[PDB]
Amino acid sequence: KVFGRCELAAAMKRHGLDNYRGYSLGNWVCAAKFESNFNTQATNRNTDGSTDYGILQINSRWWCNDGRTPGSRNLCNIPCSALLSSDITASVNCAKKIVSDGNGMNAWVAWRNRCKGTDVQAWIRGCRL
């Protein structure tokens, strides 16, 4: 599913991400924009052989099981395919664990490089929330 901007903002808020660990909703929308262009089916292989999955490009090295990432963990206790669903529940619940891991949203390199320090409220501007 390719979400609309405000559609995704509303779904993330309903799933409790708004201000989660202090990160306002626009941070999460901005991260999803640059990780996946709001496409739940996005996948991308990493140089180390792991793969990133879903709207927030969650990595099989630590967070989900895809059966082909040697030496990895599955700390969200989910198949990586669950992160591709039209229902964002699994991606949200896993993102909550990731963002609590110590480095906050810096875990998402694209958030650090493209969202951090910017006017992230622009990502939710105009949305009925």
101 is annotated as contributing to ligand binding: yes
Instruction: Name the DSSP letter for residue 78.
Output: S
Restricting to residues 38-57, which ones interact with Cl ion according to CB under 5 A?
none
Restricting to residues 57-116, which ones interact with Na ion according to CB under 5 A?
60, 65, 69, 72, 74
Tokens at residue 15, please? 């799933």
Residue nearest to Na ion (CB): 72
The tally of CA atoms less than 13 A away on the side-chain side of residue 13 is: 13
Decide if residue 27 touches Na ion (CB under 5 A). Answer: no
Decide if residue 5 touches Cl ion (CB under 5 A). Answer: yes
Beta strands 51-53; 58-59: pairing state: antiparallel
Of 31, 28, 2, 33, the closest CA to residue 14 belongs to 28
Q: How far is the CB of 65 from Cl ion (least distance, A)?
A: 4
Residue closer to Cl ion, measured from CB, 46 or 121: 121
d(CA 56, CA 11): 14
Annotated binding-site residues read 101
Residue numbers of the site for Na ion (CB under 5 A)?
A: 60, 65, 69, 72, 74
Active site residues: 35, 52
Annotated binding-site residues for substrate read 101
